[PDB]
Symmetry: C3
Subunit: 543 residues, 3 copies
C-alpha cells in the first residue's frame, strides 16, 4: 500500500505536527498548511531550501517584529497569510463620525485609544501635519513602532495572495518578480503595508501590487525603493485600492536612503484608487549629488527621465495632495482627483504632457496656494476644474487647451491658453436677458474683461427682438464704449464718437474716418485718413 | 506508515464516499471535493462546524430551491460550484436575431419556449414593460419561480470563486466580508443572480462582487440590501459584467423591505459594464417614513447622503435607463452610456457633481422625456451628447460646462451654461461658404439665434476675400439687421439706419449718434446724444 | 488503514513517478503535479480521458514544436505552465539603449544575437518594416520557426493560469469557453503568444484573455480566428498588457485563411494596454468573396457588422499604428494613444461613433499621411490632439465636435466641425497684448483666417483701456479691412470706407448706407439703399 499511497496522494505537511515553523519547512515537499496560530519572535528566520512550495494559511502568525522567509523556490505562493502584532498600541483617529478631517492638534490628541486598527500610531510626520501635536501627545503615544511584518528576503518569483492582518506589514527585501496579489484589506502598522525594497543587489524588477486593498497604517500603503521595470515597464501598482494611509497611498521614494538611491524608474501606476490618505494619494516624485543614480549635471533636480506608465487613477479625500510627481518627458493621462484638502495636483514636471485631467474641489483647506501647480514647460490637453465649491491653476510655463468648468478666470495663470480647433460656435445663454462672448487680456487685467460681443433682449421674452453690441473697456470700466445694432428694435446702428476734438494720432488705418464732437458749433466732424494716408478733417453732421 | 502518511498527505474528503453532503461536511478537515452530482431538496441545510474548508467543485448541485451552507469558518472558499434547477421553465426572449428589442407584447409572447437559458421567466415587472402581456401570456408561463440557489447563511470571510450554473442563484444572507469572485457566467433564474441581503443583524459590510460575468435572470444580476461599507467603502461591485438582466445589471434596493430599510451606503461601483438589461444598467437609487433608516425630516426624499464611490462605468443596449440614481452630495465620474431605449441617465440628485459624462444615443424609443434628466441643484463638468442618431437634457436647476456633440440647442434646458476658461478662440468652418459664431438667449427664444458674427466668402474659393457681418434678430427673423465689413471686397462698412424718424428713446448712450431716414427730403439725419446727455438732431447726408 | 487513507487524502499523481506524460495522465484522478522537467517531441499528444483535472506545474515543458493536450474535462485548469524551446535562435532587437526605435536595416541587422528573449526571430513582415533587411540578413537568421507551444485541442471549459516561458506559445485550437488567465509574462516565439483558432467546427465562443502580460514574440501577442461571442459578447481581451510584439498587441484576423473566414464578431477589447509593438497596438480589422462569411453584396469591404465592445484602451510607443479597425455601426470609446511612429488611429469605419478619443504625438516618423484617418461617414465626439511635438486628421466624411489641443487648423480636414451647445463664452488671452476670436472658412483658405474679433491693449499693462476691432481679409491679406472701437482710448468708432466710387452692387441690404471716397472733391459720399430698395448717392462729409 505504502508504494501506492506514495504515488496517489498530494503531499502536504501541516504546522500542527511541528514545534517550530522551520521544522515544518524542512519537512515540506509540495504543500505546507498553517493550521494553527504561530507566535514568532522578531527576526525569526525560516529557510525553505529553495523548494517551490505552496503555503496555504488558515491561521495567524502572531508577533511584533519580522518573520523572515528565505530561500523559497521560484514559483512559490503563499495564500491567506494573516499577520498580527502582540502589542495593542496607542492610535489616533484624525476624522470625525461624519468623516470630517480633524486638523486641530488638541482635537486629534483627544482621539487617543489603544487599538490594532481604526487609526494609526503617530510618527514625526504627524508633528508637521497637526502643528503642536508633538507637545500635546503623552509620552506613551510617542515613538511607537508596532508592526507584525512578513519579510520575504532575496527571493525571485514568489507571490503572496490574499494576505491580511492587524498592524500588519509585508516587506519584499532584495526580491525580483514577486507580486502582492489581492491583498485582503490588511490593517497597517508602523511601517509601509507593502514595500518592495532593493537598496542592495540589482534594482528591483518584476515586482507588482496587483488588485486588492489595504486600510490604515502609519505611513504609505504601497511603496517602492530602487526599482526599475525597464522599457518593458515590468513592475508597479495596478488595480489597487488604498484607504486612510497615515502617509500616502502609493509612493516611490526620493533621494538618498542609506548610502544609495531609493528612486524608481519605468513602473506602472494604473487603474488604482486612493481614498482619504492623511498625506498624498499618489506620491510619484523622485527628487526631494545622487549617489547610485544620475548626477545632477546630467539631469537637474526634478528632471529625471522617470518614464512611469501612469494612467486611469482616482483620488478622493486626501488631507494632502491628491497627485504629486516630478520628472521630465512624462506622459500622464486620465487622472481624476476629487475633494482634497490640499492641492489636487502638485506637478514638478518639465517637458511633460498631461491628457484628460480632472481636478474637482481641491485645496479646500487652503493648505497650498493652488488647486493645481505645474512648474516646468508642460502641455495640458483637457483640464476639468471646479466642482460645487488663491489661484486655481498656476502653471506659469505651460500651454493649456480644453479647460471645462465654472472657473474664475482671474484664478488662472498659464503661459498660453488656446482653442485652435473649434468648429462653428454657438453661445447658449440660460437664465439671463443676454448672451455674451467676452475677451480678457490678462496682461491688461486678470479681473476685468477688455471687450465683449453681447446680444440683449429688446422688450421681454418672446419679443423676437434683440440688440447686438460690441464693447471696449475704458478707464478700467468694462463696456465703457460700445456700438449697438437694433437697440430698441430701431433697426439702426448706434455709433460712438470722440467726445472732443479727435487728435491726429487717434485714427489708425487709411481709408477710414473717425467721428468726433465739435461742441463750439454743435457739429459732428470727421477725422479722415485718406486712402493715400493723408489726414483731413471734414464736417460730418450739422444743424 | 499510518503515522507518516498522516503527516505527509493533504487532507480532503470527496462526496462520492458519502450518501449526503452533511456526512461529507462532517468528515471534512481541510479540503472537500464535490466529485459527483448531488441532488438537493429545497431547504437542505449543511452545517460545516465552523471549519475553515476549501471546497472544490467538479460536479453539479441539482435542485429547485435553496441549498443552505452554514457555519463555514472565516477563510473558507468554494470554487467552481455549478447550480442547476431540475425544472426547465417557460422563458421569453424579447430580442430578435439581429439583436433588436421586441417591445410588442404579442411579439414577445410568441418567443415562449421551455429552456434553462437564453431567455427568462416573466415576472410582474414585465406586465409593465410589455403592456398587455399579462393578458396574452398562457397560465403555465405565469407566476413561475425556478431558481437553483446556493445560500451562504450568516457567515463571515467566505468567498465563492468561479461559480456557474443554469437558472442559478447565489444568496449571501446575513453575511459579512464575503465575496463573489470571477463568476463564470452563470445563467440566472427567477431571483437575483448575486444577492447580498442584510435585513437582520448588522448592516452588511465587506461584501463584494469582484470580476466575472452573469447572463440572463428574471431580475437584477447583482444586488445589495441594507449594506454599508463605512467610510472605508468596504463593499461593492468592481470589474463585473452583466448581460441581459431581466431587470437591472447592478441594483441597490430602495424603500422598506419587510419591516426595515433595504437601502445601502458607502459602496463602490467601479470599472463595470452592463449590456442589454431589460430594465436599467445601474439602479443606484435609495428612495422610491424610513423605518431603520434616516427620517424624512432629517433627509428629504431622494436626498440621502449615500456616498457611494462611483467611477468608470459603461452601459449599452438598455431597454430602460442606462444609469439611474438619487442622493445628495454625491461625486460621480467617468460614466459612458451608449445606445439606450430609455433615458441614458435619470438623476434624482441634489448638490452633486458629475464629471466627464458621455450620453450617446439614448431614449431612442421615446420611453422617457429626455436623454438625461437631473432634478436638483447639481453641477455637470464635461457632457458629451449625441452619437449618430423631446429634450436631450433637462436639468432645470443645474449648472453645466463643457458640452460636446451635435446637440440641438433648443433641446437643452439647464439653469446655467458657461465656458468661463477658454483661451483665444478659432471657429473653423468646413463644407460651408461661411463661418459663424452665434448667440442664443433662451429666454427670448430657444429656437432662434438672437445675433451672430459671420464671415462669408466674397466671390468663390481662393478669392482671398470675405466679408464680416454682425447681426441682430428682429420680428422673429434671425439676422434681420446687420452691419457688414468688406461686402463684395468693397473695403467699406455697410451701416444700417432706422428706416424712419428715430424716436428719442432709441438712442442708448451719450456721445453716440444713430442714423435715421427722413423720406420727405431724401435725407439721412442723425439722432445725437451729446457727451453731456442732451439730444440733438443733425443732418447727416443730403443730395 | 488503506480504506481510511483512501477516503481522507487528496488525490494527485506526480510526473516524477512516470516515464511519459501520458502515463501520468492515465493515472491522474483529481490532481497532477509536473514536478520535474519534461522534454517533449513536436507533436507529442496527451489524452486526458475527459477527466476534470487540476494540473499544477512546478517545472518546465522543454521542446521545439507542439505539446498537444486533448480530452480534458470541462472545468480543468493548468497553472504555472512554463514552455521553453530547446533551440536558442537568432533574434533582432530593433531598439536602442535609450529605447529609441531603429528603422535602418543595417542598424537592425547589427543587433543580431542568439537568445531566447530580448528580441525576436525575423519574419517576412520585417522585410517590409525595415526595407532592405531581407538582403542584409545572413541566411542562418532567416526563415527560423522556433516556438515551444502548448496546444489545447478541441476542449471546452479549460483555463490556463499564470503560464510563462521562453520562446513560448499557447494555442487553443477548436476550443470553446477556455481562458488564458494572468499570463505571467511569457516571452514569445515565432507564432502568436496566445491564439484562439476556430477555423473548423463552430465559431469560437467563450474564449478570453483575462489579465496578465506577454513580452516579445515575432508576431501578435493575442489573436483570434473565426470567433463570435454572440450578442452576449462572450469572449475577448480584458485587462491584458502586451509588450514589444513583433507584430501587433491584439489582433483579430482578416480575410480568408485556408478555405474559410478568419474574421471575428461580438468580442470585447477593454481595459487593456499595448506598449512598443513593432506593428500596431490594436489591429481590430476584419477585411484586407468572403468564403464562410457575409458576401460582399451584403456587406461591402470594410463594412461588416463586427459589433465588438471596445472601451478603455491605451497604446504607447507603436512603430506602426496605435489603433486600427474597420466595420460599420461600431461604438468606440475612451481610447488613449500616445507617442506612435505611424498613425495613432487608422479607421476604415462607416456609420460609427467614436467618443472621447485622445491621439497624442503620433505619426512622429511620417510613416503615414496623418495622425488619425477615418474613411467613412463617422461621428467623433471629443478628440484631443497634439502633445508636445502632413495632416493631423483626415476624416473627409465625418462630423466632429469637441477637439482640444494645440492643433494647426490647416491640418484638419473633416466634413463638418461644430460646437452647437456651448454656453456663454470667455476667450482668455495669456502672454499677449490682445485676445482674439478668429473665423476661418476652409473653403476660402485653410491657412488664412477670414475674419476676427480682437481686443488690443491701449498703452500698456494696467492701463484699464483696450480697443476692440472687427476685421475681414482682402487680397489674401488677413485683417486687411477693419472697424475699431476705442483705438487709443479715443472712445469713438473708426469706420472703413470704400477708397473709390462705390459701385451699385457693393451695397447689400436696404435701409443701409455705405460710405465711399470721392477724391475729386475731397468728399465722403454715401451709397444709400433706401428702405424701399432704391439707390441714391448722398454727400456725407465735406470741407
Amino acid at each position: 500500500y505504502s508504494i501506492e499511497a506514495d504515488k496517489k496522494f498530494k503531499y502536504s505537511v501541516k504546522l500542527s505536527d511541528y514545534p517550530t515553523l522551520q521544522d515544518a519547512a524542512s519537512a515540506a515537499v509540495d504543500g505546507l498548511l498553517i493550521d494553527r496560530d504561530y507566535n514568532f519572535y522578531g527576526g525569526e528566520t525560516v529557510d525553505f531550501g529553495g523548494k517551490v512550495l505552496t503555503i496555504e494559511c488558515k491561521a495567524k502568525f502572531i508577533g511584533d517584529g519580522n518573520l523572515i522567509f528565505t530561500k523559497l523556490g521560484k514559483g512559490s505562493r503563499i495564500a491567506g497569510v494573516f499577520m498580527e502584532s502582540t502589542t495593542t498600541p496607542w492610535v489616533i483617529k484624525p476624522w470625525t463620525d461624519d468623516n470630517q478631517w480633524l486638523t486641530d492638534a488638541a482635537a486629534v490628541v483627544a482621539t487617543l485609544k489603544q487599538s490594532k486598527t481604526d487609526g494609526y500610531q503617530p510618527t514625526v510626520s504627524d508633528y508637521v501635519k497637526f502643528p503642536g501635536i508633538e507637545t500635546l501627545l503623552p509620552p506613551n503615544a510617542k515613538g511607537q513602532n508596532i508592526t507584525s511584518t512578513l519579510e520575504i528576503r532575496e527571493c525571485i518569483g514568489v507571490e503572496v495572495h490574499r494576505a491580511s492582518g492587524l498592524m500588519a506589514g509585508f516587506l519584499f527585501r532584495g526580491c525580483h518578480f514577486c507580486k502582492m496579489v489581492d491583498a485582503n484589506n490588511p490593517s497597517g502598522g508602523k511601517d509601509g503595508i507593502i514595500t518592495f525594497e532593493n537598496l542592495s543587489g540589482d534594482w528591483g524588477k518584476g515586482n507588482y501590487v496587483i488588485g486588492g486593498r489595504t486600510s490604515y497604517g502609519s505611513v504609505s500603503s504601497a511603496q517602492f525603493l530602487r526599482n526599475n521595470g525597464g522599457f518593458e515597464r515590468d513592475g508597479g501598482v495596478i488595480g489597487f485600492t488604498s484607504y486612510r494611509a497615515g502617509e500616502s497611498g502609493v509612493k516611490t521614494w526620493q533621494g538618498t536612503v542609506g548610502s544609495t538611491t531609493s528612486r524608481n524608474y519605468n513602473l506602472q501606476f494604473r487603474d488604482s484608487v486612493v481614498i482619504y490618505p492623511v498625506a498624498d494619494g499618489f506620491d510619484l516624485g523622485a527628487d526631494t549629488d545622487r549617489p547610485g543614480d544620475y548626477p545632477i549635471t546630467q539631469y537637474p533636480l526634478h528632471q529625471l527621465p522617470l518614464n512611469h506608465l501612469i494612467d486611469n487613477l482616482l483620488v478622493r479625500g486626501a488631507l494632502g495632495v491628491g497627485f504629486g510627481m516630478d520628472g521630465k518627458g512624462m506622459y500622464v493621462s486620465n487622472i481624476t482627483v476629487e475633494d482634497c484638502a490640499g492641492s489636487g495636483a502638485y506637478l514638478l514636471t518639465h517637458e511633460s504632457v498631461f491628457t484628460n485631467i480632472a481636478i474637482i474641489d481641491t485645496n479646500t483647506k487652503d493648505f497650498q496656494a493652488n488647486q493645481i501647480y505645474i512648474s516646468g514647460a508642460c502641455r495640458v490637453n483637457g483640464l476639468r476644474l471646479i466642482g460645487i465649491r488663491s489661484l486655481t491653476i498656476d502653471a506659469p510655463n505651460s500651454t493649456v487647451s480644453g479647460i471645462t468648468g465654472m472657473v474664475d478666470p482671474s484664478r488662472i495663470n498659464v503661459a498660453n491658453l488656446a482653442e485652435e480647433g473649434l468648429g462653428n460656435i454657438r453661445a447658449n445663454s440660460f437664465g439671463y436677458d443676454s448672451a455674451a462672448i467676452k475677451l480678457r487680456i490678462h496682461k491688461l487685467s486678470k479681473t476685468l474683461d477688455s471687450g465683449a460681443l453681447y446680444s440683449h433682449i429688446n422688450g421681454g421674452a418672446g419679443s423676437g427682438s434683440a440688440y447686438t453690441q460690441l464693447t471696449a473697456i475704458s478707464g478700467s470700466t468694462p463696456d465703457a464704449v460700445s456700438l449697438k445694432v437694433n437697440h430698441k428694435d430701431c433697426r439702426g446702428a448706434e455709433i460712438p464718437f470722440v467726445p472732443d476734438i479727435a487728435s491726429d494720432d487717434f485714427i489708425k488705418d487709411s481709408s477710414c474716418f473717425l467721428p468726433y464732437w465739435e461742441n463750439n458749433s454743435t457739429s459732428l466732424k470727421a477725422l479722415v485718413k485718406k486712402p493715400n494716408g493723408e489726414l483731413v478733417r471734414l464736417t460730418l453732421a450739422t444743424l
